[PDB]
């Protein structure tokens, strides 16, 4: 069978009652809520640009305090020039980035324009797409009129902004205009991800043309017709975590399948981003696995890098309303942009697409057995729990979690352990689980078998967590070999039976 467990049709999904959208101490809203109307471009609030240049807000490229002379005036002069050759664009970007003229490589940008694109596609790029991108970038002070707070470590805070505002900001990131975000050995913003796109232009990987095609598809779409909706970014930091060994909650339902993807088959569900602690990972440099792919096909995710500080162990980032602009095939070395995608998601009463994504970063384990250490299992349980918990929401109102082999592959996670950890965390948060094994049918069967075994025997979250502690002590703590003598799921079956 291609899937096992509860039919996916029985899982809860959004949208199938939001309070009034309003700014407050914990919610920054950058549009006029009284004028928010379906199918209409939102109006920025306030009407006139207001600047904050300090350690708690984004340092805007258009700030009168962005100096070198006015850097914004220099950016305008540099970018309001005809581009007919890729060198023209490199020279323009470097005019206001002189210190990086010998450090930043533009080989991928030159190769994309001169060596990947046919003549007609290159002419379209420099006659239409790039000039339109410049104009929306330079419109920033009329679009993004309200200071954007940094979502700093330990802040529980939300930002709601328009897709149009995000497009203006991302066009600035493409042209590398955000100040104080470039130095390798920086103090300010050292705990924040890269935002400027300069590393997208470097090197000769065959992945870069696919990344550029995916992003130019977005830029062509949102400069041609302004998107009309909103996106919310919420940093969530929890302090009260379950006492996992004493948790009496039962397991929830499971649908597990080796076909499908989180973003296509988990529509309306809480979609997990297998995130780097610097959210978005290598999206605008070299990475191209699950997180980077999602950030490329839903580029509004990328702007989280402008204002989201690196995630601590008890935090996540929740993004609601991003739109899918591209379809793709493959991943990593086989990733290819396929075509433009028309997103058919409904919008909620805040005009946000009904798409909710949570970024939770797994640990990277240099040694396979490290992840069975109780502190490390508890860390991952609490990270998933923070990503799944919605304080103040009834369980009947929570969609299923759509996830998969979180932290596996490069970070060395054990898929069978990580699956059970997510099942326990979802159970504690009172959510069902939809698990995509991405081609691995044996893993599907194994996860299903363990899940049904535990539920039919009515084991609680705590019952299972104590079995994980026993596995560590019996098979991992005093193991001198890189691998344990008995695997986790066999151990659990034997211990219970
Ligand atoms: C879209 N999509 C992808 S592409 C994927 C996936 N499961 C594996 N992949 C391939 C990328 N491989 C990694 O991402 N390994 S990892 C944990 O990120 O470090 N699912 C569930 C998915 O929906």
Resolution in A: 1.9
Nearest to 176 by CA among 226, 239, 240, 133: 133
Binding-site residues, ligand 1, Cβ < 6 A: 261-262, 274, 289-290, 293, 331, 404-411, 436, 438
Spacing, Cα 173 to ligand 1 middle (Å): 26
Domain span at residue 54 reads 1-497
Contact between residue 3 and residue 255 where contact means Cβ atoms under 8 Å apart: yes
Rounded to whole angstroms, how far apart are CA atoms 236 and 247?
22
Contact between residue 408 and residue 400 where contact means Cβ atoms under 8 Å apart: no
Contact between residue 44 and residue 168 where contact means Cβ atoms under 8 Å apart: no
Closest-lying ligand 1 atom to the alpha carbon of residue 274: 18
Q: Identify whether 463 is a catalytic site residue.
A: no
Rounded to whole angstroms, how far apart are CA atoms 383 and 407?
12
436-474 in b/e form (b: 16+ CB < 10 A) is bbbebeebbebbbebbeebbeeebbbbbbbbbbeebbee
Backbone φ, ψ for residue 352 (5° rounding): -100, 130
Q: Reduced to 3 states, what is the DSSP secondary structure of residue 336?
A: strand
Cα within 13 Å of Cα(378), Cβ side: 12
Sign of the C-alpha dihedral computed for residues 257, 259, 264 and 265 taken in this order: negative
| Candidate list 164, 194, 210, 291, residue with the active-site label | 291
Q: Give start and end residues of each alpha helix (H) in 372-414.
A: 374-388
Contact between residue 109 and residue 86 where contact means Cβ atoms under 8 Å apart: yes
Q: Identify whether 300 is a catalytic site residue.
A: no
Nearest to 139 by CA among 80, 81, 220: 80
Closest-lying ligand 1 atom to the alpha carbon of residue 291: 18
Nearest to 202 by CA among 114, 94, 104: 104
Tally of structural domains, the chain: 1
């Amino acid at each position: 069978k291609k899937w096992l467990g509860t039919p996916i049709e029985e899982m809860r999904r959004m949208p199938r009652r939001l309070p009034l959208l309003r700014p407050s101490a914990n919610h920054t809203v950058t549009i006029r809520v009284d004028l928010l109307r379906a199918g209409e471009v939102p109006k920025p609030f306030p009407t006139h640009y207001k600047d904050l240049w300090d350690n708690k807000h984004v340092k805007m490229p258009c700030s009168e305090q962005n100096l070198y002379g006015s850097r914004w005036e220099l950016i305008q002069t540099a970018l309001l020039n005809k581009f007919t050759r890729p060198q023209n664009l490199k020279d323009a970007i470097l005019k206001y980035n002189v210190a990086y003229s010998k450090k930043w490589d533009f080989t991928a940008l030159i190769d994309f324009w001169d060596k990947v694109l046919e003549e007609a596609e290159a002419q379209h790029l420099y006659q239409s797409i790039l000039p339109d991108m410049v104009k929306i970038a330079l419109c920033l002070p009329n679009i993004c009129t309200q200071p954007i707070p940094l979502l700093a470590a330990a802040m529980n805070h939300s930002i709601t902004m328009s897709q149009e505002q995000i497009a203006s900001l991302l066009a600035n990131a493409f042209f590398c205009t955000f100040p104080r975000r470039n130095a390798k050995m920086k103090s300010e913003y050292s705990s924040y991800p890269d935002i400027n796109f300069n590393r997208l232009f470097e090197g000769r990987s065959s992945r870069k043309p696919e990344k550029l095609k995916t992003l130019f598809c977005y830029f062509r779409r949102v400069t041609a017709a302004a998107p009309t909706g909103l996106v919310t970014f919420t940093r969530q930091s929890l302090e009260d975590f379950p006492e996992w060994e004493r948790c009496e909650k039962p397991l929830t339902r499971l649908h597990v399948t080796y076909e499908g993807t989180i973003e296509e088959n988990g529509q309306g569900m809480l979609q997990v981003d297998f995130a780097n602690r610097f959210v978005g990972g290598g999206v605008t440099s070299a990475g191209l696995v699950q997180e980077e792919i999602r950030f490329l096909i839903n580029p509004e995710l990328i702007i989280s890098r402008l204002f989201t500080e690196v995630l601590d162990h008890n935090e996540c980032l929740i993004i609601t309303g991003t739109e899918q602009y591209s379809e793709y095939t493959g991943y990593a070395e086989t990733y290819r942009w396929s075509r433009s995608h028309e997103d058919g998601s409904e919008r909620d009463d805040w005009q946000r697409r009904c798409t909710e994504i949570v970024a939770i970063d797994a640990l990277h384990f240099r040694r396979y057995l490290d992840q069975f250490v109780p502190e490390k299992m508890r860390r991952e349980l609490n990270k998933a729990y923070c990503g799944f918990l919605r304080p103040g929401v009834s369980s009947e109102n929570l969609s299923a979690v759509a996830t998969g082999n979180w932290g596996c592959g490069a970070f060395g996670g054990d898929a069978r352990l990580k699956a059970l950890i997510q099942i326990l965390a979802a159970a504690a948060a009172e959510r069902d689980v939809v698990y995509f094994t991405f081609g691995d049918s044996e893993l599907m069967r194994d996860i299903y078998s363990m899940h049904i075994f535990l539920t039919e025997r009515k084991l609680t979250v705590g019952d299972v967590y104590k079995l994980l502690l026993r596995y560590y002590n019996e098979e991992c703590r005093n193991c001198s070999t890189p691998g344990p003598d008995i695997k986790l799921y066999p151990f659990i079956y034997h211990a219970v039976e």
